[PDB]
Amino acid sequence: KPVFSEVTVHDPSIIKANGTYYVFGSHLASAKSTDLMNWTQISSSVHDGNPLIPNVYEELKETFEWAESDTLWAPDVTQLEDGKFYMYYNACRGDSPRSALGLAVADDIEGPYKNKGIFLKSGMDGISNDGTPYDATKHPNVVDPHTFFDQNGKLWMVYGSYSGGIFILEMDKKTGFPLPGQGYGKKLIGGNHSRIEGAYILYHPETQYYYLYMSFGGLAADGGYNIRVARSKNPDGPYYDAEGHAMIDVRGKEGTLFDDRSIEPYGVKLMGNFSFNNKNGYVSPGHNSAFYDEKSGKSYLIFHTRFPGRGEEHEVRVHQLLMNKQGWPVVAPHRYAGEKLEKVKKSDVIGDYELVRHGKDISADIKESKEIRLNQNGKITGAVAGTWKNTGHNKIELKIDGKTYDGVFLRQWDAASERKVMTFSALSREGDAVWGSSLKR
Template structure:
């Protein structure tokens, strides 16, 4: 879910997915809804603000910010922060943050994000809070969870979910895939000594799965993740896959019953026409309707990353489908 991971992008680009494809044929994938204004974005997280309107945060800048009154016309509103918090420079020389996730609980907005460098899992996830959720109003609270080169996971691409009275954070990229830890709801940081649960990987190195997002629908938890290569413009091969579980910590399986820990995952959305490399996804609710937010690379605009929004619906069998 980031402009990230330097496990040789060229090598990643040739990784061919061996996972089952049970979703729509490519020609039936819907285009993103038409939007206007500032469309450029990468790894979007979107929320309908309680004060009205929408905010989208993203990779780029000091967590780039976009605002909209109607979910159609978007304006560039600068960044979440005026300057990078000093501790970000422990993880890259430019203080560059990746892949934010916004949520609302306990009377305030919470913004999670990652800081790292290409090609290393010396990485950290941080958190900030705001009363309004608007750019320029965030107070940073430091590190939530970290990874080092001795770990078999990568602490980037955070996404939160509340389940069974507990707060959980999924995360991960390459380095054996998607993980999950429990958070302290008071601090928003990892519970001391928390178990690092393993949710999804693939059998083929470099384990090109990242950017998880989990939602509850009915009695199931659904794990969405981006597979293959991002960040290469029109040569990107990003696609979104999904599995589900009756437990937030897994095991997650696809519609054929294949575990996501064994390379399973139903294909939800992939590139088609001008919309290349669909991924970096998140999900938000708007007036009771689920929406999928993601980026794609516009083949008709030199591969520029842009915001994709599609309605997310559910089949009779309880599987998600984009419209």
């Protein structure tokens, strides 16, 4: 029987070193595991003695002073070619995009990290890093970085939260700082205080797309946080959703703040708030990272989540990512327990399921699963009427609610009944996800 050990790390950013997985999150929090199931908490908050930066208030004083905050927001740690660990740290006042983004470097992944300096600021009253006066409708909040190598070995950093949008900068592979002359870099999506943050870019060698993951909505339990994805053949875009909408054009209306209605039609929404059979479930799952394992070919979505009825409590969750026939990733409905893709036959997948329809909205509503049956005759009955078929090794196609969904079947552990179940997870061109988890073991 699978065993989990939980940790609390907001906005987890995954990195593997020395055969061990680490997550680095906000508030200088971190955790590690060798199996992605049993995590050990390393650090939890910004304070004297935090092992990652034990003198943090002195070490990063310029950042705390600029941001007028006593904590840190969502970092990234990335190993560069010198073998050292580069932490892109940031702080934000919280009520406005008054933020600083800097670089610290460690010899060892668990610290200590040493400050190399601030290299981006937002929320100044005056000249911004692009030379024009700072304007949060068009300039980023300098937080939430992800620094990554593309398949050509070029180093990039994508970043941003709300404010002027999500931007990407080309980075110096030797110093870890941005190449000169870029200002805030190139916009990928957003503007006008859109609720979009937590960018993360992952390349998949089979489809040869870069996937731009991002979180729409608000992180709190009333915020409707949801992970969405878009893709491009290039690390720096242009990024498109499954309807071919250009992410660069997605933003709230001029003169508005947090215009969710304008942005929610866009992107492929992978997961919102849900509860299978009203047992446990997730609320505002989001701010993800993602990992592709070259050895196994498996991919993983790593994120934090809140929970129905548990207020603002959050923990790290890991779900396997599968790849549908169209080259869009689908999230396995249950957390990772060591399971792998297998050949399924018709008798394996026929039967009753709990169905979650995540939809395409930004919504704080917790969506309850409803019962359907995948009948032997290829029809879906119960909560919805439709059709389905299994193709290839383990692909599913469903037709429901006027749409066609392409996805993948996967046997998983259900941690609410302590039993193995059959699942499917699929996506429509329209960008909404459906999950099924079988009533049968």
